[PDB]
């Protein structure tokens, strides 16, 4: 699959018991945004660690 | 030592 580099996860979601990431691609518009599996991701922690940031500062 | 900062793509 390529492999891209990734800017940062836009949001989150689960369809039935499945994470899902919404991924903004570096260099890429939001035109190219894609819902990713978990997997995909889990060993970019820089990224992760920053989304998890941006909902907890948003948690109303 | 930094994290991979890169993903494959399935959603395409």
Redesign the interface.
């Known amino acids: 699959?390529?492999?891209?580099?990734?800017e940062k996860i836009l949001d989150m979601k689960t369809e039935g018991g499945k994470v899902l990431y919404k991924?903004r691609?570096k260099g890429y518009t939001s035109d190219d945004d894609?819902?990713?599996?978990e997997i995909?991701?889990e060993?970019?922690?820089?990224?992760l660690l920053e989304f998890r940031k941006k909902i907890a500062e948003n948690k109303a | 030592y930094?994290?991979?900062?890169?993903?494959?793509?399935?959603?395409?």
Request: charged content about 35%; overall charge negative; proline content about 7%.
């Open positions: 699959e390529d492999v891209f580099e990734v991924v691609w894609t819902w990713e599996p995909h991701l060993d970019c922690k820089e990224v | 930094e994290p991979s900062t890169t993903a494959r793509k399935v959603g395409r």
